[PDB]
């Protein structure tokens, strides 16, 4: 039972409603209370910020807030939460040995490919389709023009020969009789073969319109290095990653963008990334990897950087520091942290992690089936056209 603020949105009366907390850190806290018998009383931090040393508008004073402030001001006694171990926080409080090793990484929206109906006509430009359609018929008529006026093939036979040779169907088993028609038809067969091969060589590529435009090569990629209006990338405001970006004097060019767009909590940032409001979210490897595993339409693309670990921070002079560190190390050595990872992090419903070429799906090639259906519904009329032609 953990008593926390009711409304996450700022500017609202934050009533301390008792909710209930469960998960990795709560299980670890219960284990810690068991191994060294002390009683705990969990309460959520007042403001959603993790905690950074900020300059209050009252000048000449830096203040710790968030969980860091709640621990330093005596309101708390131990920060059992994914608190990143960094130099800035370590000067004022002492962290235990890390209970989870992770690092910063980039979460983005995995683009679901869209299958256009003209995907199979896409490899050839429409003028090429028109030209090949005209070519089929001019060759077809010229076959019988050459064959009929030959001193040494009807309309239907010539047309069927040309079309079947183009499509490789064998519908028309009528070969030309005149010599010139022989050379013409065989070179037409060769041209049809080359056209078909050139179409085939890119049909698969044009069937799935996927490109690595959104793929991010860590933080060294230009799209992160060079800010732009469209590429809106962010983190959680007032957290460890913000401290890391501010401290990096070389990466301050990134920081100018970070302060423009930031989010109150991790959930809001991942929701914004999901709803395509955001282009990239910089956050811990554990949280982002779990979100990618469960919320299946987002992908963690960034190369791992700033490797650190979550630590159970306490006060500067806390009697439990040695014992809590020893307990964390003991849990690591046997199969306890592995159990927590298995029951809280390792499980997943889908990952879509496969470097093999994408498997063709029903929604991917619906155009082919609709084209066949259109052939059905055109032939159903062509039957009546044929009987009408027979009437005359």
């Amino acid at each position: 039972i953990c008593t926390g603020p009711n409304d996450t949105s700022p500017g609202s009366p934050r009533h301390t409603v008792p909710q209930c907390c469960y998960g990795f850190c709560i299980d670890l806290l219960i284990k810690l209370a068991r191994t060294m018998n002390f009683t705990y009383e969990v309460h959520l931090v007042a403001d959603g910020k993790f905690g950074t040393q900020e300059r209050v508008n009252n000048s000449n004073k830096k203040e710790w807030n968030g969980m860091m402030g709640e621990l330093l001001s005596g309101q708390a006694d131990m920060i059992v939460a994914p608190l990143t171990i960094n130099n800035e926080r370590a000067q004022y409080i002492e962290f235990s040995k890390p209970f989870k090793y992770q690092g910063l990484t980039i979460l983005v929206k995995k683009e679901i490919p869209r299958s256009t109906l003209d995907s199979f006509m896409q490899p050839f430009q429409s003028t090429l389709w028109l030209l090949v359609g005209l070519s089929v018929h001019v060759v077809a008529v010229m076959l019988y023009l050459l064959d009929r006026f030959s001193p040494f093939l009807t309309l239907s036979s010539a047309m069927w020969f040309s079309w079947g040779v183009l499509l490789n169907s064998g519908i028309g088993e009528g070969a030309p009789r005149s010599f010139s028609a022989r050379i013409l038809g065989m070179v037409w067969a060769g041209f049809a073969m080359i056209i078909v091969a050139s179409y085939t060589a890119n049909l698969a590529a044009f069937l799935v319109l996927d490109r690595p435009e959104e793929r991010i090569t860590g933080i060294n990629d230009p799209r992160l290095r060079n800010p732009s209006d469209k590429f809106i990338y962010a983190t959680v405001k007032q957290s460890s990653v913000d401290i890391y970006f501010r401290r990096q004097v070389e990466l301050s060019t990134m920081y100018r963008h970070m302060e423009k767009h930031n989010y109150e909590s991790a959930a809001e940032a991942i929701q914004a990334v999901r709803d395509n409001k955001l282009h990239a979210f910089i956050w811990d490897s554990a949280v982002l990897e779990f979100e990618a595993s469960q919320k299946c339409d987002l992908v963690t693309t960034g190369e791992l950087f700033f490797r650190s670990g979550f630590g159970i921070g306490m006060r500067k002079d806390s009697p439990w520091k040695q014992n809590v560190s020893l307990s964390i190390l003991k849990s690591h050595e046997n199969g306890f942290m592995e159990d927590l990872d298995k029951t809280w992090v390792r499980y997943q419903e889908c990952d879509s992690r496969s470097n093999a070429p994408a498997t063709l799906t029903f929604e991917n090639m619906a155009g082919v089936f609709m084209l066949v259906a259109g052939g059905i519904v055109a032939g159903i009329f062509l039957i009546f056209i044929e009987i009408a032609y027979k009437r005359h």
Partner: protein, 280 residues
């Protein structure tokens, strides 16, 4: 490992729904349409013609006579060339050698109970380390079996793995990762694509109550926060295999022969069935 290829490797290029809708629904519907067109030559012949056109191997067929039937056969041939292009375009990558790890992890039955295996499993670790103490504390039986196939050093264990005298080597994760990276040809690899069990870290030991502890901790945290640790890892820990067409054998593509065998059985079964139907 030498690797393995699943018997279905030749079947994934299309999803199961796509396969079943093309070769059951769409094809039979188109065959019925071809007969309706031609009538206005048995239905088996129409199905045979469509199936032969699906993969045109010059298999004998009986072409229809109606013009509308010929048009429908033409559009089916277009669908067939689409199918062949899509199927053959990525078949080579799909029928590829897939490397499967010998063991899932340290808790696998091969390690925990190596005796219930016709070939014994040979795994060992160098003594007098943290890994040996951890294994002794967690799995006394596994450690007792492991002491027989002990090792002298990291290089001795590596050459034992290379020759074949040893199957698995349990050791520090960072040293093993470095060895796998610096290995040539990449015959050695850590299971789980970087699986780590105890997940501790390297520390700088100090006497109890040493005055240097706090300053060293702050300095190390400043180093890791300034990106210098990444530079050092790139300079030292990075390796060769980290940044990373073959002949086809019976095991490589046995699935196609499995399909042929299933067809042989089905053909014999339907022969017996037709004999029974004719007799009765």
């Amino acid at each position: 490992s030498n690797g393995t290829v699943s018997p279905s490797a030749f079947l994934e290029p299309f999803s199961a729904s796509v396969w079943v809708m093309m070769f059951v629904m769409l094809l039979i519907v188109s065959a019925i349409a071809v007969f309706v067109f031609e009538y206005f030559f048995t239905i088996g012949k129409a199905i045979w013609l469509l199936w032969g056109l699906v993969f045109n191997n010059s298999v004998p067929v009986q072409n229809p006579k109606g013009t509308t039937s010929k048009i429908m056969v033409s559009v089916w041939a277009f669908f067939a060339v689409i199918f062949l292009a899509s199927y053959t375009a990525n078949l080579a990558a799909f029928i590829q050698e897939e490397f499967v790890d010998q063991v899932t992890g340290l808790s696998d039955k091969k390690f925990q109970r190596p005796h219930d295996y016709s070939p014994p499993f040979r795994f060992g670790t160098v003594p007098n380390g943290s890994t040996e103490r951890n294994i002794r504390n967690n799995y006394p039986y596994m450690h007792q079996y492991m002491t027989r196939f002990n090792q002298r050093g990291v290089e001795d264990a590596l050459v034992s793995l290379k020759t074949g005298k040893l199957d698995a080597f349990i050791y520090d994760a960072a040293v093993l990762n470095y060895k796998a990276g610096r290995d040539e040809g990449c015959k050695l690899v850590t299971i789980g694509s970087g699986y780590i069990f105890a997940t501790t870290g390297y520390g700088i030991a100090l006497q109890k109550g040493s005055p240097w502890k706090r300053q060293i901790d702050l300095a190390l945290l400043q180093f890791v926060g300034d990106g210098e640790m990444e530079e050092l890892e790139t300079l030292w820990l990075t390796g060769i295999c980290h940044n990373e067409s073959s002949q086809l054998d019976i095991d490589n593509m046995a699935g196609v022969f499995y399909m042929l065998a299933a067809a042989m059985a089905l053909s014999l079964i339907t022969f017996i069935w037709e004999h029974l139907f004719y007799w009765k």
